[PDB]
UniProtKB/Swiss-Prot annotation:
Group of enzyme by EC: hydrolase
Annotated catalysed reactions: Hydrolysis of proteins with specificity similar to that of pepsin A, prefers hydrophobic residues at P1 and P1', but does not cleave 14-Ala-|-Leu-15 in the B chain of insulin or Z-Glu-Tyr. Clots milk
Name this polypeptide is given: Endothiapepsin
Annotated transmembrane regions: none
UniProtKB keywords: Aspartyl protease, Disulfide bond, Hydrolase, Protease, Signal, Zymogen
Region of the whole protein represented: 90 to 419 of 419
GO molecular function, one term: aspartic-type endopeptidase activity
Upper lineage: Eukaryota, Fungi, Dikarya, Ascomycota, Pezizomycotina
Amino acid sequence: STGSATTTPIDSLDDAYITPVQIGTPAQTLNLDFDTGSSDLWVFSSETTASEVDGQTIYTPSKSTTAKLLSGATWSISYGDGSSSSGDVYTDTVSVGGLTVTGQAVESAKKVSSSFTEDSTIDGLLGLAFSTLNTVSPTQQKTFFDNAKASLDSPVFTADLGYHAPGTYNFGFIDTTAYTGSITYTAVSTKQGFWEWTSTGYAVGSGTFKSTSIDGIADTGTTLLYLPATVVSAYWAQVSGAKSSSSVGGYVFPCSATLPSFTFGVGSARIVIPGDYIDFGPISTGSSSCFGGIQSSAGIGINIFGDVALKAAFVVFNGATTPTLGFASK
Ligand SMILES: NCc1ccc(C(F)(F)F)cc1
């Protein structure tokens, strides 16, 4: 079997993408953030603290004939940006774009951090990293992708994120009309539980390609591109008036500047990120300083190929016994 669902940016800057997901019987439709950097499916629910909910759609397990409490199980998760959430665990039926999994662990949030509460467009997260990162205790739970794997035509899913436009998440098949040229596959290390891979180098604008190995993760749940300080300094040095700001927390640039493109390597192939993709707009309403989409990973400890990079490509997450990542121009 297969599934296909449209994913839509939550705002005019593509800060995140939400995808409708059906949970329970009868279906309760929630808009979830598909996150290849984590492995928990957690949702706002009727069990979330009332003061911590501001306009989100909530999952109500008491109205689902298929919901079962996973007795004794708890979850607690903290994201790299400081966000966090925790609660208990139900099992229920979950469908994405026609693809249905029964007995999927649905982690009901009793407490959520402030950054989730103030984001009324995101009802929860659907983790698509490897199940070794799932935070359910004492019995670790499988992701939606892992549970669906056996019934999928092919053990793959693809991310086709749009620039200021809707895109597509496909499960179980590769849409050969969605990309141009060939798909370049590259090896994945699962050692840390991420879709971790090694980029073969980079170029800034029309400059020479610098062959160097950049280890990083493919993370649909991260907005920006986080790369080593040397790479990020070489990019912003080409933008008149750009500078790293301690008060803002990253590189900013005059909104009147035009940004060069950024090229990253996948084996022998090249993926070009247009300069417009790196513009994240004024740091405050009416400001003439704009925030950059390429930032240093030095504070984080891991390089992150977030939405800025992934939306420039058609990306195949191949969950075969030897996992691989495929990149194609589109
Ligand atoms: N989008 C999920 C996510 C968030 C943060 C990290 C970090 F910071 F640990 F790299 C990995 C994955």
